[PDB]
Amino acid sequence: GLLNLGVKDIGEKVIFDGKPLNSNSGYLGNKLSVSVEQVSIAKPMSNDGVSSAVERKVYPSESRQRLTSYRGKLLLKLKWSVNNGEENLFEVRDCGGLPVMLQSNRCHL
Amino acid sequence: MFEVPITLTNRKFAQRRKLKYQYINYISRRFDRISKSDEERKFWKKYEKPEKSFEIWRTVSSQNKQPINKQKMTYHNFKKIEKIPLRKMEIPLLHCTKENKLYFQSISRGLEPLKTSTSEVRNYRTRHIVTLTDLLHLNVSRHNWSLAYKIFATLIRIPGVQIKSLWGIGVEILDNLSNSSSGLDFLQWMCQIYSSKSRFVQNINYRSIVPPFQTGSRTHTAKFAITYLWSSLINCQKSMEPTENDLLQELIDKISEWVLTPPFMEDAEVWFIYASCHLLKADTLSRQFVNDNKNNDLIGLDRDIKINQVIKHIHYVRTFLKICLDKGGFAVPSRLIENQLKSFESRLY
Amino acid sequence: TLKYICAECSSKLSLSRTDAVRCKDCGHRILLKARTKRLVQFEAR
Amino acid sequence: YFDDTLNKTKIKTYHSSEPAYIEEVNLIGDESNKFQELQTVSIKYRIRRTPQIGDKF
Amino acid sequence: KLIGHEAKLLFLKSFQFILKRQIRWLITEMRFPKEFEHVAKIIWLKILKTINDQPQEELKLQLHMTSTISILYLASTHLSLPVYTCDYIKWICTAKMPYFQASEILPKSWRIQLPNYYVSILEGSISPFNGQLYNKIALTCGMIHFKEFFNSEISCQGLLLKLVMQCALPPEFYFYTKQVIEFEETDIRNLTLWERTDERHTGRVSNHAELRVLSYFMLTINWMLSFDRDRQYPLKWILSLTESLTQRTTTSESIGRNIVKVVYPDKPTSSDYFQWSEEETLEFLKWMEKQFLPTQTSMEMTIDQKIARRKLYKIFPLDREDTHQLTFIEDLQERYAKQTPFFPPARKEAIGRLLTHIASQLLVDFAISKEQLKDCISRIKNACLHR
Numbered sequence: 001g002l003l004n005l006g007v008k009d010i011g012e013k014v015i016f017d018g019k020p021l022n023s024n025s026g027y028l029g030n031k032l033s034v035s036v037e038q039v040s041i042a043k044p045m046s047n048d049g050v051s052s053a054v055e056r057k058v059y060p061s062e063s064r065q066r067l068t069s070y071r072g073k074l075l076l077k078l079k080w081s082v083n084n085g086e087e088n089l090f091e092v093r094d095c096g097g098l099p100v101m102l103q104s105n106r107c108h109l
Numbered sequence: 110m111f112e113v114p115i116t117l118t119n120r121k122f123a124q125r126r127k128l129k130y131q132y133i134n135y136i137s138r139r140f141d142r143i144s145k146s147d148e149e150r151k152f153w154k155k156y157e158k159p160e161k162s163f164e165i166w167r168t169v170s171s172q173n174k175q176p177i178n179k180q181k182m183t184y185h186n187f188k189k190i191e192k193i194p195l196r197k198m199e200i201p202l203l204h205c206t207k208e209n210k211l212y213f214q215s216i217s218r219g220l221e222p223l224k225t226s227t228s229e230v231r232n233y234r235t236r237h238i239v240t241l242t243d244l245l246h247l248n249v250s251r252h253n254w255s256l257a258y259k260i261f262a263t264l265i266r267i268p269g270v271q272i273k274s275l276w277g278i279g280v281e282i283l284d285n286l287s288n289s290s291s292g293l294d295f296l297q298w299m300c301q302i303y304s305s306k307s308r309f310v311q312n313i314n315y316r317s318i319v320p321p322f323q324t325g326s327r328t329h330t331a332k333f334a335i336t337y338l339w340s341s342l343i344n345c346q347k348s349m350e351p352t353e354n355d356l357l358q359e360l361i362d363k364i365s366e367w368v369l370t371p372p373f374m375e376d377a378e379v380w381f382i383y384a385s386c387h388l389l390k391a392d393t394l395s396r397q398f399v400n401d402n403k404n405n406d407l408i409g410l411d412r413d414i415k416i417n418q419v420i421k422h423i424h425y426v427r428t429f430l431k432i433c434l435d436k437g438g439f440a441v442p443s444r445l446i447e448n449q450l451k452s453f454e455s456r457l458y
Numbered sequence: 459t460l461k462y463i464c465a466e467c468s469s470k471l472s473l474s475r476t477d478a479v480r481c482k483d484c485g486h487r488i489l490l491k492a493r494t495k496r497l498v499q500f501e502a503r
Numbered sequence: 504y505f506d507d508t509l510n511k512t513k514i515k516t517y518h519s520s521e522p523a524y525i526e527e528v529n530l531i532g533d534e535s536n537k538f539q540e541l542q543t544v545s546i547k548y549r550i551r552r553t554p555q556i557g558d559k560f
Numbered sequence: 561k562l563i564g565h566e567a568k569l570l571f572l573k574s575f576q577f578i579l580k581r582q583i584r585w586l587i588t589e590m591r592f593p594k595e596f597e598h599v600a601k602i603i604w605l606k607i608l609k610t611i612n613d614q615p616q617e618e619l620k621l622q623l624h625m626t627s628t629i630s631i632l633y634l635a636s637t638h639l640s641l642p643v644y645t646c647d648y649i650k651w652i653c654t655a656k657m658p659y660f661q662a663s664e665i666l667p668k669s670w671r672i673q674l675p676n677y678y679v680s681i682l683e684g685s686i687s688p689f690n691g692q693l694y695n696k697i698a699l700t701c702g703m704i705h706f707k708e709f710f711n712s713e714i715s716c717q718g719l720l721l722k723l724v725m726q727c728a729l730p731p732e733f734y735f736y737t738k739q740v741i742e743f744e745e746t747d748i749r750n751l752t753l754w755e756r757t758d759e760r761h762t763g764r765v766s767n768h769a770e771l772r773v774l775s776y777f778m779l780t781i782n783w784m785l786s787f788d789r790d791r792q793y794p795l796k797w798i799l800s801l802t803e804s805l806t807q808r809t810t811t812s813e814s815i816g817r818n819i820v821k822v823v824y825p826d827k828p829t830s831s832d833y834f835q836w837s838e839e840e841t842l843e844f845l846k847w848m849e850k851q852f853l854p855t856q857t858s859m860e861m862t863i864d865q866k867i868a869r870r871k872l873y874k875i876f877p878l879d880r881e882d883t884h885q886l887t888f889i890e891d892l893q894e895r896y897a898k899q900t901p902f903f904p905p906a907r908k909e910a911i912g913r914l915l916t917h918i919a920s921q922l923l924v925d926f927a928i929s930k931e932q933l934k935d936c937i938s939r940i941k942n943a944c945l946h947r
């Protein structure tokens with residue numbers, strides 16, 4: 001999908017901790033490459049009291065009656081690459097509720 | 110004799126633990142040296158956790174950590190380490206019950222207790238429950254369906270059931286119960302009854318629910334949720350290809366509602382089971398367009414729109430099988446599935 | 459008995475100042491206040 | 504409603520040029536963590552509009 | 561939520577309450593008119609008398625789970641309607657008593673009356689160990705000065721009957737044992753309930769009359785059987801009485817004794833647990849689906865935790881996703897017939913074989929002491945040889 005191509009195009013954001021090491025003084029030796037591999041979107045759900053509850057599908061009728069937004073959990077697989085590959089870290093981070101379009105591939109209808 | 114549904118009468122067992130650990134950190138320490146409540150939490154902080162399974166089984170082939178150190182145990186050397194931790198166990202041994210004094214003096218000699226803590230508890234509610242948990246297990250060990258169901262149904266109405274054997278004998282009794290229910294329903298009720306989408310491991314003394322057989326929704330798979338999907342694909346297979354259908358789609362959309370977080374998030378059968386449901390959806394469509402060129406003499410029947418719908422799928426399923434391998438798979442014998450899929454493609458020609 | 463219908467299960471109920479604003483039969487958090495036998499006059503135009 | 508700080512029975516008045524009728528009253532505890540006091544209510548007013556001189560057609 | 565004296569007053573009150581509920585089921589089960597009811601009242605009126613006196617801030621009272629039945633036991637003894645072991649087994653089997661769980665009350669509120677070193681400890685804490693059952697009956701007699709107040713304590717020619725029918729209904733053994741009782745059993749006089757063991761050490765003086773009745777019962781069988789010189793009881797006859805017995809259904813009774821066995825104590829019935837003769841298995845689950853419901857009713861939980869629960873039960877729904885079994889005297893008759901055939905080292909072994917069995921039975925209804933029992937046995941053994 002277009003969004004995964006977009007995140008494949010943003011690439012990396014590199015930062016060097018000023019790798020002290022005591023080339024090791026102008027080649028640092030402190031590479032940190034941060035990127036985003038995947039981006040996932042989930043259909044609207046609401047769990048109350050937090051987690052320990054049974055989840056229910058959230059419908060547009062609910063968002064209208066409640067006079068609230070119709071949000072889907074936005075998740076994105078964060079890639080935390082250390083020393084250009086010395087250490088790879090994956091994390092699925094939840095980025096709050098992205099409003100989903102009705103009758104789209106992300107609305108229950 | 111079998112595993113009981115309840116938090117273990119927390120009375121003497123909790124102070125026996127104190128004395129066990131406190132001795133192990135004392136004796137352990139003076140070893141750690143001669144090689145130069147909290148104390149139970151510190152014991153677990155001194156050797157990590159077991160993760161998502163049972164026994165930190167991991168290979169047998171990589172690092173040859175050459176372990177020799179000649180044995181290093183001169184009866185004389187053990188009693189140098191031990192002579193001081195035992196006198197420091199006394200001070201708290203005094204403050205402990207006469208039963209826990211010798212319980213400690215037994216395990217510090219290396220004797221093990223033939224007195225199962227679950228063979229003494231004296232509580233009304235409890236003890237019955239031991240009778241029911243044992244009756245049900247003796248009734249499935251002879252397949253008594255009509256009686257195992259009654260004991261199971263009473264066992265959960267009594268206040269002492271943590272999914273436990275309820276999810277592991279509650280599906281076994283509904284497969285053996287030729288009558289009402291598809292472990293499935295019960296399996297899908299469980300899935301919603303402990304998604305535990307929260308990544309909780311380690312920290313506190315899990316001694317109320319150890320069993321990687323209830324828990325998860327963090328990382329550590331749930332095995333009733335994996336069994337729900339496996340039982341669901343086997344429930345789709347029976348009498349397909351032998352609008353009220355949907356099931357093989359219901360399972361494509363119920364596994365998609367996931368698409369990693371905890372399950373997608375973690376790899377394997379999640380991906381693999383999905384592809385397997387997807388691979389079955391490819392056959393069924395080759396059958397429904399197979400026998401003697403589709404059904405028979407040709408198709409003329411506009412293009413083969415049906416071949417293109419199937420080749421799209423076959424190409425997709427090879428993507429799901431590949432990402433399941435790449436991400437460290439643990440169960441797909443790729444050679445056989447690729448040969449089956451190519452020979453099955455031959456049918457589509 | 460005052461009445462409140464669950465917006466999603468249709469189950470009638472009678473909320474009190476001492477209960478959670480939730481459908482006790484489904485778990486919904488939206489309740490339609492039920493109509494009752496209450497007199498209203500109307501000019502027929 | 505009643506606020507303990509004011510020890511008074513207060514009301515939200517209806518302010519309009521014309522009368523209406525209450526069509527639906529919906530009690531909202533939703534999106535809340537507990538909020539059991541039922542502090543959000545949605546009230547729908549029905550205003551009938553008879554064709555009248557000056558109405559556009 | 562009350563601590564101290566008034567917390568105690570309602571802990572007192574609640575105790576007051578459940579005993580009364582206990583007594584009225586008492587009447588319905590036994591239909592023993594005003595009489596059973598009023599004697600029981602004043603008994604506790606008498607018990608209350610002393611509690612007030614050592615008050616000030618005396619909190620030694622809060623009676624144990626057992627004190628209540630000791631009270632009903634003492635009062636019955638007055639009336640001398642029944643027996644202890646029988647009463648206890650019957651009560652457990654049918655949950656006749658509200659004894660097991662203390663949620664009943666009329667408390668809802670007494671429940672919340674917080675616990676205050678009390679109310680929570682009441683109703684259903686644990687099942688009795690050894691004497692322990694009486695280790696308080698004596699104390700109550702102590703509090704009560706019961707023997708002076710009430711006539712004929714511990715007695716019952718009915719416990720003997722209960723016991724002979726209990727198994728080897730050997731009609732003759734009723735007055736065999738009645739005779740040895742006649743003998744040195746308190747100078748041929750009906751054993752009265754022991755005294756008000758005032759002392760807190762609760763020494764094992766074994767004056768609990770029944771305990772001795774069972775002892776004479778066992779002894780009688782052994783002696784009489786040991787020396788039946790005339791050979792009135794055939795070699796092959798003794799084991800037959802054993803083969804016939806070793807288990808079987810029960811027109812309610814044996815099913816009950818299974819339910820008591822399931823306090824899984826010293827492992828004498830534990831294995832019965834294991835074995836549990838087929839149906840015994842079945843009528844067990846029946847009695848669990850009827851009398852375990854007397855189980856319970858999480859609170860609040862937004863209906864949520866509860867609903868889910870309801871659904872789950874909706875799920876396994878179940879409870880059905882010669883009237884066959886027989887009565888007590890039917891079973892009794894049929895094994896008395898199963899021995900229908902009446903008219904060295906081995907028999908001694910068989911006799912010991914049989915005595916262990918009864919030791920199991922009589923001991924199992926009661927506080928046992930896989931040796932006090934015999935300590936008890938030992939005692940009168942000694943008592944006897946002063947002819």
Ligand SMILES: [Zn+2]
Binds near residue numbers: 466468481482
């Ligand atoms: Zn509802």
